[PDB]
Amino acid sequence: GIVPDAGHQGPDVSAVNGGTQVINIVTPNNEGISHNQYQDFNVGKPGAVFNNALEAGQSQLAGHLNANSNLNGQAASLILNEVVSRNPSFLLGQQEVFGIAAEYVLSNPNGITCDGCGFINTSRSSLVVGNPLFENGQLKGYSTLNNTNLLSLGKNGLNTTGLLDLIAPRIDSRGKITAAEISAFTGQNTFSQHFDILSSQKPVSALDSYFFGSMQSGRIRIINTAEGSGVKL
Template identity: 35%
Template sequence: MYREFNVDSKGVVLNNSPSDLSHATLGNIAKNNNLTNGSASVILNEVTSNRASSLNGFIEVAGQRADVVIANPNGISCSGCSFINTNKAILTTGKVTFSDTGAIASYDVTGGKLSIDKNGMDASNSYAVLLADAIAINGTVNATNAIVAAGNFTFDNGSGAITSAGKAATARQYVYPEYSIDISNLGGIKANSITMVGNNLGFGVRNKGAIVANTSLSLTSFGSLTNEGSIASNGMMTQVLSAGNFKNTGNISSNNIALLNSLSSISNSGTISSTGNLLVNASGNIENTGKFKAASTLSVMTNGNLKTTYGSNLLSDNQLTV
């Protein structure tokens, strides 16, 4: 545990070796005498004071690869932070809970802000896990795989299951919307698989940047969902679900099957396309002034009204169902 945990541009090395070792650039590193039972599989860096953490350099595990956890309920900012020789890079403002065996059981998030700033986060050889009440992404997150979860929730460390606490927005927050996850036009996420969840009821998820998934993409908002940037998935499945209104003024593209579902309304003035099947469903109205396009089957379903305007398109190279 730490009273404060910060990393400057010079970076930091976490010694996970029970024996002396030679580092390619740092030279000889003496063994960590605390590792009497061998190398750790998880290195937990937990802040217990009221000070936020600033991460502006590399964090390297010397010795055996391990998960690196930085837990600070006061907030975490990363600008140019990178992770070397790590399996998972976990940044959280949640409380760490443990099992009877002493392993990390879950993270309980009830507050705190996590920001990825202009120099981004490099976890290109790691699994990036970002868990906080509010997440602002103003730089690019590069990772092998990524989980981004915001709001009040519990994250099961073993299964990866996310359980929402059901926190609802206040009346003022409904009038002046707030975003659990907010990606600016300078921000983005690039990974093989990407899972994003905004857990608070009535709080939105907004993307103005670039989200690129190579294998699978799942994006869920318990409030509204707004895309003003680009969302691209090159894998088999793209799933986008919003409990509130879904609004797209940007571009959403899928390389195979795309499922877009809103429990409220859908407004599209951009382009939503799939080289395979595109399934669009809304419990409320659908208004399209842009393009829905599928190379195979395009299905557009609504329990409300479907409104299209002059110049808009519903295009399918195979089968169109409305």
């Protein structure tokens, strides 16, 4: 399911009970960013729990858990999950931040597919079909340049009580998206770490996005930078 990278940014991964995965995220940097790298990142119906706790307590999906000692007393402000292989990601269940609420990012330039997935105890969750941009260990933004892959949301939809960002060369959504706010940025873009669009490529051929399904949110923004490409619905 979730397979950590073998290097220093691979978190400790285990699973409990019916297979709910538990990820002790790696120590956050001075900016509060826990940068976790994976060979595989997939979530099933049992869900997954990111341990961002400074003290032991009760998680929603995985029962009682100890504090995450990797935190060294400072919880992450952003939990950044980066797939560094060629494997695409499938999210079929809930992902919970246990402990201190945090921002969540999954970056996978090979593609991300949600179907009945969701986020618990996140202020903001972003799905990025692209790569994070680092400079001297500091997160500077994200890139969907030179990428034509797809963020796909299935008929069982996606739900969160927090903010949601969907970032990909193209997006295809067929189910209900429930979020406090929905921000969808399509095309080939350079982003700041707050998802400001800094610049955009013109794709070699059209990159069309399809939102079908529905959206249950008080604020929706869709920005498509691929001139001549459309938002179908």
